[PDB]
Amino acid sequence: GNIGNLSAEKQISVYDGQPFVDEQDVPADDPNTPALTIEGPDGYVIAVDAGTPIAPEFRDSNGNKLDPSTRVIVQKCDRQGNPLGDGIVFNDTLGRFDYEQMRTDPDFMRKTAKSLMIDEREIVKVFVDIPAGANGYDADKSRLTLGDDTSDFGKAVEIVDHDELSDAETRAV
Amino acid sequence: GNIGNLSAEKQISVYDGQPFVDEQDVPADDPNTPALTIEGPDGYVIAVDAGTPIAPEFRDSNGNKLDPSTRVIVQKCDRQGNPLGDGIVFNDTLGRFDYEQMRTDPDFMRKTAKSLMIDEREIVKVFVDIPAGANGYDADKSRLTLGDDTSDFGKAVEIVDHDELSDAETRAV
Amino acid sequence: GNIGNLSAEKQISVYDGQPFVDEQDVPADDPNTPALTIEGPDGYVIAVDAGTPIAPEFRDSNGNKLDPSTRVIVQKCDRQGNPLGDGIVFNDTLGRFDYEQMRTDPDFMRKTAKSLMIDEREIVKVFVDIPAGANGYDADKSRLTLGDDTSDFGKAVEIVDHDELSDAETRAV
Amino acid sequence: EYTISHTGGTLGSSKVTTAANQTSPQRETAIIGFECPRKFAEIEYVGQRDSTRFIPRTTESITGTAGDDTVVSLTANIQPVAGETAIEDQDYPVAVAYNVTQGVQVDIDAVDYAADEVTLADNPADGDTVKVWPIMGDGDVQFRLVNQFGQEEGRVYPWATPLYRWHDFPQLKRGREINLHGSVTWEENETVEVLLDAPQAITWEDSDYPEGQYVSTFEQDVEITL
Amino acid sequence: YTISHTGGTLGSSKVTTAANQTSPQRETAIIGFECPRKFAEIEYVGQRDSTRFIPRTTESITGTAGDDTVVSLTANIQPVAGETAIEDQDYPVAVAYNVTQGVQVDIDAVDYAADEVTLADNPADGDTVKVWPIMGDGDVQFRLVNQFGQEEGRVYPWATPLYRWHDFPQLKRGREINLHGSVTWEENETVEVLLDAPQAITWEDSDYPEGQYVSTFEQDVEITL
Amino acid sequence: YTISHTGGTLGSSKVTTAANQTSPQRETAIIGFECPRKFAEIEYVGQRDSTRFIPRTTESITGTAGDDTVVSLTANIQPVAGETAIEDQDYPVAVAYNVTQGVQVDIDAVDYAADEVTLADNPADGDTVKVWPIMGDGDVQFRLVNQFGQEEGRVYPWATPLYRWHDFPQLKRGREINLHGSVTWEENETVEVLLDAPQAITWEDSDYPEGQYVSTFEQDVEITL
């Protein structure tokens, strides 16, 4: 009744519900709030190649999609919560997104630009630049799906435990 | 006044109205009764390469679709018409077949997984495993379309008369 | 305040609203009269190949569509405006189009056949073989594009100015 | 020498082709004869790229009487237009209706494909007269050659082809459009005929049709020398 | 020497197990696929052979005046394939049935955000109606069990959310689900599909109109003989 | 160290000027993107940078009995994305508003041929209604100007038809718009979107429901810091 062993390279996906991410309420006039705080697992390590899909299903408390004049950014920070500035992966508006099929058709999948790596403590954050009007933001009635680990389309996020020389060179930030 | 010399491998598709395929109204839960019986044409050989589509447009007497949880199976039988156990080309359900476009979009098509070869006498049977509650099977208001011979998508069914070495190797059953 | 250099082959989309193709309202059984007169623009050479689409948005005076079964043919003509027997690129009908989405998706497009190359005086004429039942052709509310210059899909119209070897070879008609 | 693609069909290149109906008792018989003209020299068929369109239709005729919104199984196993059911989303109407008394068009409401029935909005009068043209269902066609004597010379993919596939596929979509099978040569005065077998009337020349001029339409593509 | 098959709600034998979970937030075993004596082995290969899951739960309401709206169903709803209109889905978000009249009810409108809906049939007072909507939240995964009753282990310990099964057009190739890991069976061994969630999945409710099963689980696999 | 970004209706500055045209068919200038001091310069790359445009116009009527129907709007109306049914379209073809009742109207249906529509409710004799459909026919292009008010050029001197902007699903790659040519801004320079058309495209009708803006523009761009 064997199962088949695996390497460390777990091909997975990422979203709000997992216990290393926290959503947060966001009003409509701050591009500097930690919308999402994505903290490392404290002993495993994540890797993302560029060209990785995103599905930012953001709506309001009344369920309507927000004003596509709004911009969204995903960005790396330090181990405290201070953005590194460089290492950005994404910057675009919601107008380039189609919630009806944004995570299904490859011809709608907005992907990453530059690769990324998260050690046992490295932080990722999301930032949302919004005009005055569009009813804020509720994450409880919204969600996100980062990467895809089900299709042949898109790609998945790599995770590993500690293997020696891989970690020795993963320290090469 | 020429005809053009044609390969005897005629590429077609198959349905119920043809006079070598008989139907049978099915009760509720008789998975051993064959709904359809495909007898060979008494003079030719059929070939179905693997990677071949099906469209089993099944409904009841009132015209509604059957249960999606139905199991549908295609199987070759002996010259008597009893199942060989092995030699299956298909095993799946109806819910996997969107009736509107199961024969339209290649992105929705369900294909075979095996080659197959039918002589003048070899028999195929389409079996249906159903729960008790369903409204049977009304072949007078349902049909099947095996293969495509019309589009630049999918594949077809080869039919041939008798050629020498082909028959010599065909009788290697 | 730069614009960048533009090479010879300008990619555009031919359509009714341009000053080198003229329309004309039509009867319902006068095919020899032209729907369109498509002149050499008197200083350029034009190229269009196989795979070039059309958007024959042909409505009647009310807006209701023309007859489906009307045949639709494209031809090269001389500098007098008479065909050449050869010099054909297209032969199909109106009802083969779908005014809802004929230009939207490529899969609902009709396209030309051959290579073609137009000098400063050469003429293309589109001819239209209608049966009696139809309500002619009303160019005003109607319209036509020959091509597209917006998608990665399909193709466009190639417009070239005068260059020595290319002109000397392409005048080998 | 030069070769090009051309299209034959209902009218086509030359006004010598001939359309005629089959038997109501089922018989495979001559229907649509493409005869070669001397405008050309010779014709070539190359199926699987030689695309083809066919719309069928038929006729039913009923009368006015109180309480009639529903029209019956028309002896025609109707199907939806390539999977779509309600007409407003269909490529073409599954059926069309006319009040000949009022001399106008009718709006169709709904369908039941199982019992092959439909339902309208404007309930008609008593003693009135109404025409309907629904698409054809069952039936099957094929091609054939004949010489300049009426003598056969060989068939063209000697195999019937069902009618309802022309409905089941969205005919106008490239990749999905219909390409029959065959590859055949003509000479100057040879004829090549489509045959049909179906129960009901292959309706052409319904002058009462408010929408076009051919309720049932036919087109194909072929290869040509000159 | 192998071919393909489907394991499913009924499948190759009536020795499977079909049960329902608990409301206390503690996982259970929804399904048990036990091998028969017929086959030497069963094998599932994540990323190769697809899996399908149409979960669905059960709720109930009492009739009274103005009772055309249905309240929060305790369920984080989403549309099917991201599409909302019930008449244009690959399968319904939800269905319901009046028992007092003993018929199915059509649904008029939806509020995905508020998790509420609106019907045409205003029921009578004291009436009884039942609803079967898709299941919302839920964390699922696989497990192995020997011929003794022991957990050999899970597979690829990263449980996928339930709602992804709803989110995609599962029938269309390329978008179908292919979970991860690998696993092998033997004659008396039993794999289980396990789930954790608040709400109670259901099956085999007789009053359901569109089949003898409200909800299904299917999986393409490879088989030795 | 450049980046990909977007200009548009508001883009990244409240300097852009959007201006209605005239009825006499002059090649009018509408939407002027002024480069700021913030950046070194702006880059446009046709065949690379997607572009989005939703035009929308204004008409009006005084209603009476039996006035469920609205005639041709002097506008060659077109379907959206190969669809006519409103709810499925990527955006509405049109919306309208009862000013006397001071509310939105939901639509019954369309007659694309005669460019007519019909509503759900009937207005009153004395009632007034306004309508905002997407614009129909006409042609557009781009123009270049410096901080000295003289035309610094035009972009690929051939206009595109208005209708193709509607006809495609703007966001889908492959189907998105990509014009031809290139251009680079400088500091106080400016680029103006020009149009000719019969009818008055407009903006910011106060009584319009769906937001502050009836019509919108976006364009992918590159910024050299």
DSSP string, B28-78: SS-TTS-SEEE---SS-EEEE-SS-BEE---B-SSS-B--TT-EEEEEEE-
Report the C-alpha gap between F191 and F29 in whole angstroms: 10
What are the distances in angstroms from CA A26 to CA A29, A60, A142, D37, F79? 9, 10, 12, 77, 37
- Closest-CA residue to A126 (of A114, A143, A149): A143
DSSP D89: G
Which residues, other chains included, contact A86 with Cβ-Cβ below 8 Å and sequence gap of 6+?
Answer: none
The radius of gyration of chain C's CA atoms, rounded to the nearest angstrom, is 17
Which amino acid, residue A63?
G
Query: Does E140 lie in the same domain as E31?
Result: yes
Locus of tokens 């109930």: E60
Distance from CA of D172 to the nearest CA of C (A): 6
Answer whether F67's CB lies under 8 Å from A110's CB: no
Cα D131–chain centre separation: 19
**A interface mutation test: which of F173, F216, F225 has the most A CBs within 10 A?**
F173
Length of chain C: 173
The H or E element containing residue F21 is none
> Chains C, D in contact: 3+ Cβ pairs under 8 A?
yes
State how far the Cα of A118 lies from the Cα of A77, in Å rounded to an integer.
10
B92 φ, ψ (degrees, to nearest 5): -165, -170
Among candidate residues F75, F80, F115, F119, the one with its CA nearest the CA of residue F96: F119
Task: Please enumerate in sequence order all residues whose Cβ is within 8 A of that of B71, keeping only pairs 6 or more positions apart, or say none.
Answer: B31, B91, B92, B93, B128, B129, E6, E8, E10
Give the DSSP letter string of C92-154.
EESTTS-TTTTTTSGGG--B--S-EEE-SS-EEEEEEE--TTS--B-TTT-B-EE--SS-SSS
Contacts of D2 in chain C (CB under 8 A): 86
Residues of F in Cβ contact (< 8 Å) with A133: 211-212
B8 Ramachandran zone, left/alpha/beta (phi>0; psi -120 to 50):
alpha
Distance from chain centroid for Cα C36 = 8
Q: How far apart are CA F67 and CA F74, in angstroms?
A: 18
CA distance F125 to B117: 76
Instruction: Indicate the pairing of strand B54-55 with strand B45-48.
Output: unpaired
Rounded Cα gap, residues D28 and C146, in angstroms: 43
Q: What CA–CA distance (Å, rounded) separates A139 from A56?
A: 11
> What are the phi and psi torsion angles at B89 (to 5°)?
-105, -20
Residue whose pair of structure tokens reads 């002024």 in the numeric block: F34
Which candidate from C2, C59, C105 shows the least CB-CB separation from F113?
C59
- DSSP H or E run through B86: strand B83-93
The letter for the amino acid at A51 is: G
Give the span between the Cα atoms of E16 and E10, in whole angstroms. Answer: 7
In DSSP notation, F188-202 reads T-EEEEEEE-SS-B-
Query: Is D217–C69 a contact, with Cβ atoms under 8 angstroms apart?
Result: yes
The string over C32-60, giving b where at least 16 C-beta atoms fall within 10 Å of a residue's C-beta and e elsewhere, is eebbbbbbbbeebbbebbeebbbbbbbbb
Burial status of residue C70 (CB atoms within 10 A of its CB: 0-12, 13-18, 19 or more): buried
Q: Based on the domain organization, do D141 and D226 belong to the same domain? A: yes
What backbone torsions phi and psi does residue A15 show, to the nearest 5 degrees?
A: -165, -175
Which residues are CB-contacts of C29 (< 8 A; sequence separation ≥ 6)? C130, C131, C132
Rounded to whole angstroms, how far apart are CA atoms B90 and E2? 14
> Residue F74 in contact with residue F133, Cβ under 8 Å?
no
Chains that touch F (3 or more CB pairs under 8 A): A, C, E
Residue D120, number of CB atoms within 10 A of its CB: 19
- Do D198 and D161 fall within a single domain? yes
- The answer to whether residues F144 and F213 belong to one domain is yes
**Are D178 and B141 inside 8 Å of each other by CB?**
no
Q: Tokens at residue A170, please? A: 């993963």
Contact between C111 and C48 (Cβ < 8 Å): no
Distance of CA B90 to the CA centre of its chain: 9
F89 touches chain A (CB under 8 A): no
Greatest alpha-carbon pair distance for chain B in Å reads 61
How many domains is chain E built from?
A: 2
Instruction: Give the total residue count for chain A.
Output: 173
Looking up tokens 């092959």, which residue turns up? D116
Using the Cβ of D145 and the Cβ atoms of chain B, whether some distance falls under 8 Å is answered with: yes
Give which of B46, B1, B80, B51 is closest to B157, Cα–Cα.
Answer: B46
Helix (H/G/I), strand (E/B), else coil: F37: coil
B133 within 8 A of B79, measured Cβ to Cβ: no
Residue D180 belongs to what domain range? 1-56+137-226
Considering only the beta carbons, identify the residue of B4, B104, B145 that sits closest to D83.
B104
- Beta partners for C162? none
d(CA B103, CA D178): 13
Contacts (Cβ under 8 Å, ≥6 apart) of F21: F28, F30, F195, F196, F197, F200, F201
DSSP state of B165: H
To the nearest whole Å, the CA of C105 is away from the closest chain D CA by 10
Scanning the structure block, which residue is given the tokens 């960048």? C4
Query: Rounded to the nearest 5°, which phi and psi values hold at C166?
Result: -65, -45
User: How would you class D182 by CB atoms within 10 Å of its CB: exposed for 0-12, middle for 13-18, buried for 19 or more?
Assistant: buried
Closest CA to A28 of A128, A105, A120, A123: A128
| Lookup result for tokens 């689409």 | C53
Verify that D112 and D177 share a domain, yes or no: no
Token pair belonging to A164: 């020696």
CB distance E149 to E156 below 8 Å? no
Q: Are strands C14-15 and A157-160 parallel, antiparallel or unpaired?
A: unpaired
Query: CA–CA separation, F219 vs F225, rounded Å?
Result: 17
- d(Cα D4, Cα F157) in Å, to the nearest integer? 37
- D50 plus D142 within the same structural domain: yes
- Cα–Cα distance measured from residue F84 to residue E88, given in angstroms and rounded to the nearest whole number: 15
How far is residue F82's CA from residue F93's CA, in Å, rounded to a whole number? 12
Domain ranges of chain C: 1-173
- Interface residue C138 vs chain F (CB under 8 A): no
Angle ∠(A47,F172,E171) on CA atoms, nearest 5: 75
Say if strands F103-105 and C10-12 run parallel, antiparallel, or are unpaired: unpaired
Gap between the Cα atoms of E31 and C43, Å rounded: 76
Rounded Cα distance between A12 and A148, Å, is 7
Chains that touch E (3 or more CB pairs under 8 A): A, B, F
Spatial separation of the C-alpha atoms in residues D173 and B101, rounded to whole Å:
13
Task: Judge: A107–F172 Cβ closer than 8 Å, yes or no.
Answer: yes
Partners of chain D (3+ Cβ pairs below 8 A): B, C
For residue D157 the two structure tokens come to 């993919």
Residue A8 near residue A45 (C-beta atoms within 8 A): no
Our CA angle for E135, E136, E137, nearest 5°, is 120
Phi, psi of D194 (to 5 degrees): -80, 140
Phi, psi angle pair for B167, to nearest 5°: -65, -40
Asked if D151 and D220 sit in the same domain, the reply is yes
Between chains, do D213 and C132 touch, taking CB under 8 Å as contact?
A: yes
Amino acid at position B168, single letter: A
F9 shares contact with chain A (CB less than 8 Å): yes
CB burial of residue B42 (10 Å; 0-12, 13-18, 19+): exposed
**Are the beta carbons of B46 and B40 closer than 8 angstroms?**
yes
C131: its two tokens: 């049966």
A115 in F contact zone (CB under 8 Å): no
Last residue of a domain, one of E135, E156, E178: E135
By the 10 Å C-beta count (0-12 exposed, 13-18 middle, 19+ buried), E87 is classed as exposed
- Count of other CB atoms within 10 angstroms of residue D112: 14
Interface of D with C in 164-203 (CB under 8 A): 172-176
Neighbour count for residue D59 (Cβ, 10 Å): 15
Contact E114 A4 (CB under 8 A): no
- Enumerate the residues of chain F whose CB falls inside 8 A of the CB of residue C65: 113
* Non-local CB neighbours of A18 within 8 Å, separated by 6+ positions: none
F116 by Cβ neighbours in 10 Å (0-12 / 13-18 / 19+) ranks as middle
The three-class DSSP label of residue A165 is helix
| Chains in touch with A (≥3 Cβ pairs < 8 A) | E, F
**Closest-CA distance of chain E to residue A66, Å:** 14
What are the tokens at F223?
A: 């910024």
> Which value, in Å, is the radius of gyration of the alpha carbons in chain B?
17
F154 beta partners:
F143
Burial class (CB in 10 A: 0-12, 13-18, 19+), E23: exposed
User: For residue D45, is it left (φ>0), alpha (ψ between -120 and 50) or beta?
Assistant: beta
Radius of gyration of chain A (CA): 17
H runs (alpha helix) in chain A: 164-170
C-beta of residue E214 within 8 angstroms of C-beta of residue E55? no
By C-alpha distance, the chain A residue nearest F175 is A107
> Could you give the count of Cα atoms lying within 13 Å of D36 in the half-sphere of its Cβ?
26
Resolution (A): 3.8
Instruction: With CB atoms and an 8 Å threshold, state whether A104 touches E146.
Output: no
Q: Kindly list the distances between the CA atom of residue F53 and the CA atoms of A66, C76, E134, F76, in Å, as whole numbers in the listed order.
A: 18, 37, 38, 18
Q: Do B96 and E171 touch (CB under 8 A)?
A: yes
Mapped onto helix, strand or coil, the DSSP state of residue B166 is helix
Please give the backbone phi and psi of residue F138, each rounded to the nearest 5 degrees, phi first: 130, 170
Short-list C15, C115, C92, C25, CA closest to C55: C15
The neighbouring-strand residues paired with E219 are: E7, E51
Q: How far is it, in rounded angstroms, from Cα E202 to Cα E135?
A: 10
Residue C135 sits at the chain D interface (C-beta within 8 Å): no
**Structure token digits, residue A157:** 């996020």
Phi and psi at residue E69, to the nearest 5°: -85, 140
- Decide if C142 touches F, using CB distance below 8 A: no
Bridge partners of residue F62, in order along the sequence:
F128
Backbone phi, psi, residue E83, to 5°: -105, 145
Residues of D in contact with C134 (CB under 8 A): 212-213
Dist CA D129 CA D117 (whole Å): 18
- D147 plus D132 within the same structural domain: no
Chains B and D touch (3+ CB pairs under 8 A): yes
Cβ-contact F97, F104 below 8 angstroms: yes
Question: What's CA F13's distance to the chain center, in Å?
Answer: 19
| Residues D108, D79 within the same domain | yes
**Does one domain contain both D207 and D157?**
yes
CB A153 within 8 A of CB E177: no
Contact B138, B61 (CB under 8 A): yes
- Please give the order of strands across the beta sheet that includes D117-120: D70-71, D117-120, D108-112
Phi and psi at D33, nearest 5°, equal: -100, 120
Q: Which helix (H) or strand (E) holds E184?
A: strand E182-184
Residues E119 and E147 in one domain: no
- Residue of chain C whose Cα is closest to the Cα of F44: C3
Residues of F in contact with E85 (CB under 8 A): 87-88
Q: How far is CA E42 from CA A4, E149, E182, F213, in A?
A: 13, 19, 11, 60
Chains A and F touch (3+ CB pairs under 8 A): yes
Is-contact E107 E134, C-beta < 8 A?
A: no
Q: Where are the alpha helices (DSSP H) in chain D?
A: 165-168
Q: Give F-chain residues touching A93 at CB under 8 angstroms.
A: 6, 218
Question: Helix/strand/coil (H, E, C) string of chain E?
Answer: CEEEEEECCCCCCCCCEECCCCCCCCCEEEEEEECCCCCCEEEEECCCCCEEEECEECEEEECCCCCCEECCCCCCCCCECCECCHHHCCCCCEEEEECCCCEEECEEEEECCCCEEEECCCCCCCCEEEEEEECCCCEEEEEEECCCCCEEEECCCCCEECHHHHHCCCCCCCCCECCCCEEECCCCCEEEEEEECCCCECCCCCCCCCCCCCCEEEEEEEEEC
On whether any CB of chain F is under 8 Å from the CB of A129, the answer is: no
Give the whole-angstrom CA distance, residue D16 versus residue D18.
6
Evaluate whether B41 touches B101 at the Cβ level (below 8 Å).
no
Closest CA to D165 of B36, B14, B20, B39: B14
Same domain for F120 and F194, yes or no, is no
- Residue C75, token pair as written in the block: 């031809």
Chains within contact range of chain C (3+ C-beta pairs < 8 Å) = D, F
